[PDB]
Design goal:
part of a larger assembly, 6 chains, A mainly alpha (about 260), B mainly alpha (about 30), C mainly alpha (about 40), D mainly alpha (about 260), E mainly alpha (about 100), C: about 40 residues, mainly alpha, 2 helices, E: about 100 residues, 6 helices, about 60% helix
């Protein structure tokens, strides 16, 4: 019945409309479902007192129609009043849009982010690390180890090696996970080379993971560098498992390549 | 763990996809 | 079996076609001829 | 009691400087209380009976200026006020003669599905009472069949009120109607019969139709031109569509799916 | 099954208080549940059959009237079948046959 | 609950009449079909046809 009052040109009746387009949005959802869609008219009409709320009620109404890109573009263009509420049955409806579209966008941004990159909204990436702070702050880290893979981002994953969860062997068995679920070489060696440098910058430098990564990684000089750190440290008992896992699990050509860096 | 529960379960969707195409091939090949 | 989940609550057909054409027409068509003998 | 209006509403102020203060006065109704069903505070109806009378007279003068799109704004608001199941006036001297007046203009708007939909509204008010709104449904009902002169008899009987703005669109919808179906198997007609069935004896309106279409002005003559010969005798379009359909047979005849 | 029963049970007085809501059932994605256990589908096609009946789409209605008729069990208490047996040839009397 | 759909059948009734008579007879006056169809008016007997 509030569909009739859309030719007023006093925009205060339109904000009286969106005053009624949010709270009782389910019974007239039947009524105006596909009939009238003048959200963009006042949302773009410089009689603004309705723009930063206008895309909210469109993002409500198109949901059970489907229209996840309609309510997703309006979810990004809805501003501060949209994401301010997470105490409903609607935050699950919108992060399943935005986080999924963000990470399947970031598959392309793992392919080609350089050149023809996409205009990622700061909320499109902002509720990513915001809800990721909900992951870090809501005590769950078998998932907070996971969404950091899902965003295809290295430095947030390197960031959460030091969190409210500790490292007994945590963040080490996660590479036993990622080695199993690992897709290609391209994402593999990038995370692989960056974790084993804070493994050397760790208090007790683990040797079997930095040997295993390097035969998984083809660095014929870094094992001569930490091998120089173990000759400089001068204990062949800890210069042992770094070297016989190397002889056991390395290639013949890889040892014939690393041998020059050992002897020099 | 819960993180492997989805990736290792779509892994058998990739593993699952090939087989109907396979019996699709053998469906004509056993005829001819 | 035969449950009907309930939300709300020959001998005949050739005869029924005789009713379909001659539903209510000339039922006692017996004396109209003798009534047309003098009018026709 | 925030009334502001009770002096100039009954007297004819035809599209004068009452309409803008009137619409902003309805805006002042909106700033005080929403035109919502107000299920809480049922006693309070200052927002319902008074503002509903104001909104129905505001619907009423909308036709006096030919405000066609904003007519159904106020009128749709009235119908949604009779959507309210609250104890108010079951009806008035306006609910029939305005709601079925909306039925009478929609009857002209040439939307018959929306014409019939509203019949859930008043199931008992159709025939058994409410002759004034029985008149549009019998009217468009007569527009269904070949009833023509009886429609002009309903132009001899407009009992409720003027209905002039709607019976003039009813004029026009007869004008294009038999301006269209004058083109039938009408073998020859003098300048009397088809002349005086519609409206026009001898103005140059008969030149407007007789030269707009054919049926040329002749020696007391309506010329029956009728070819109806060219478009039949095609095997080729059946030899294209049907040749498609034979392959559409053979797909679901031999090939396993 | 929330796709299924929540639309007849939605419909049951929306028809009795219907007007324009029907177009919502036209644009409804959940018109199909694709399986509704031989009876909710069966009466479902009838509940949407009277929709096109009352909103004047005749020939499309009568085939789902028939399809809604021919999917009902072998039980005797049949008042809804008394209803569809009537309305099924209401619309055919609207169509001449 | 069907009376508002029962009320519109007279269109189909007169289609039945004009199809029946138009099929049956071949050269009939319009001043006979309105009386046989009890139409009370031959002036729109041109118009329904």
């Amino acid at each position: 019945g509030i569909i009739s009052l859309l030719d007023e040109d006093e925009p205060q009746l339109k904000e009286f409309a969106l005053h009624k387009l949010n709270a009782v949005v389910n019974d007239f959802w039947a009524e105006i479902s596909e009939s009238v869609d003048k959200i963009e008219v006042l949302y773009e009409d410089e009689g603004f007192r309705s723009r930063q709320f206008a895309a909210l009620v469109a993002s409500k109404v198109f949901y059970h129609l489907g229209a996840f890109e309609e309510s997703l573009n309006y979810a990004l263009g809805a501003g501060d009043l949209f994401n301010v509420n997470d105490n409903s049955e609607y935050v699950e409806t919108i992060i399943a849009k935005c986080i999924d579209h963000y990470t399947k966008q970031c598959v392309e941004n793992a392919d080609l982010p350089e050149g023809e990159k996409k205009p990622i909204d700061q909320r499109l990436e902002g509720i990513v690390n915001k809800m990721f702070q909900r992951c870090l702050d809501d005590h769950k880290y078998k998932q907070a180890i996971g969404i950091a893979l899902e965003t295809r981002r290295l430095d947030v994953f390197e960031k959460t090696i030091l969190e409210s969860n500790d490292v007994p062997g945590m963040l080490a068995y996660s590479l036993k996970l990622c080695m199993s679920l690992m897709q290609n070489k391209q994402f593999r060696n990038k995370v692989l080379r960056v974790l084993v440098k804070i493994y050397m910058n760790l208090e007790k430098p683990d040797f079997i993971n930095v040997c295993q990564c390097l035969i998984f990684l083809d660095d014929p000089q870094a094992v001569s560098d930490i091998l120089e750190k173990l000759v400089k440290e001068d204990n062949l008992l800890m210069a042992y498992q770094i070297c016989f896992d190397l002889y056991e699990s390395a290639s013949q050509q890889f040892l014939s390549s690393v041998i020059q860096n050992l002897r020099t | 763990d819960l993180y492997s529960r989805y990736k290792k379960l779509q892994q058998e969707l990739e593993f699952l996809e090939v087989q109907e195409e396979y019996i699709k091939d053998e469906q004509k090949n056993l005829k001819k | 079996m035969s449950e009907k989940k309930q939300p709300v609550d020959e001998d005949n057909w050739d005869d029924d076609n005789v009713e379909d054409d001659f539903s209510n027409q000339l039922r006692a068509e017996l004396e109209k001829h003798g009534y047309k003998m003098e009018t026709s | 009691m925030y009334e502001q209006l009770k002096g100039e509403w009954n007297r004819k102020s035809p599209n004068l400087s009452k309409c803008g203060e009137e619409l902003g006065r309805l805006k002042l109704v909106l700033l005080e209380l929403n035109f919502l069903p107000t299920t809480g505070t049922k006693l309070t109806k200052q927002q319902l009976i008074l503002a509903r009378d104001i909104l129905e007279i505001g619907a009423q003068w909308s036709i006096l200026r030919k405000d066609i799109p904003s007519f159904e704004r106020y009128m749709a608001q009235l119908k949604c006020y009779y959507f309210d199941y609250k104890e108010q006036l079951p009806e008035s001297a306006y609910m029939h003669q305005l709601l079925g007046l909306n039925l009478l203009f929609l009857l002209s708007q040439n939307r018959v599905a929306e014409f019939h939909t509203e019949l859930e509204r008043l199931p008992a008010k159709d025939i058994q009472t409410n002759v004034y709104i029985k008149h549009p449904v019998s009217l468009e009902q007569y527009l269904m069949e070949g009833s023509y002169n009886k429609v002009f008899l309903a132009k001899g009987n407009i009992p409720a009120e003027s209905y002039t703005f709607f019976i003039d669109i009813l004029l026009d919808t007869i004008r294009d109607e038999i301006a269209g179906c004058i083109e039938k198997a009408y073998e020859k007609i003098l300048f009397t019969e088809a002349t005086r069935i519609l409206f026009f004896n001898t103005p140059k309106k008969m030149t407007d139709y007789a030269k707009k279409r054919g049926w040329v002005l002749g020696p007391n003559n309506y010329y029956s031109f009728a070819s109806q010969q060219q478009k039949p005798e095609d095997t080729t379009i059946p030899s294209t569509e049907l040749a498609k359909q034979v392959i559409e047979y053979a797909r679901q005849l031999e090939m396993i799916v | 099954d929330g796709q299924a029963t929540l639309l007849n049970l939605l419909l049951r007085n929306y028809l009795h208080y219907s007007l324009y809501d029907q177009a919502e059932k036209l644009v409804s994605k959940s018109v199909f549940p694709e399986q509704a256990n031989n009876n909710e589908w069966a009466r479902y096609l009838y509940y949407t059959g009277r929709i096109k009946a009352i909103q004047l789409e005749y020939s499309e209605a009568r085939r789902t009237m028939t399809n809604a008729l021919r999917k009902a069990p072998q039980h005797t208490a049949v008042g809804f079948k008394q209803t569809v047996h009537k309305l099924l040839i209401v619309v055919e009397l609207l169509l001449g046959e | 609950g069907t009376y508002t759909l029962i009320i519109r059948l007279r269109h189909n009734v007169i289609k039945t009449g004009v199809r029946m008579i138009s099929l049956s007879y071949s050269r009939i006056s319009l001043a006979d079909i309105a009386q046989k169809l009890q139409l009370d008016s031959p002036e729109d007997a041109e118009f329904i046809v």
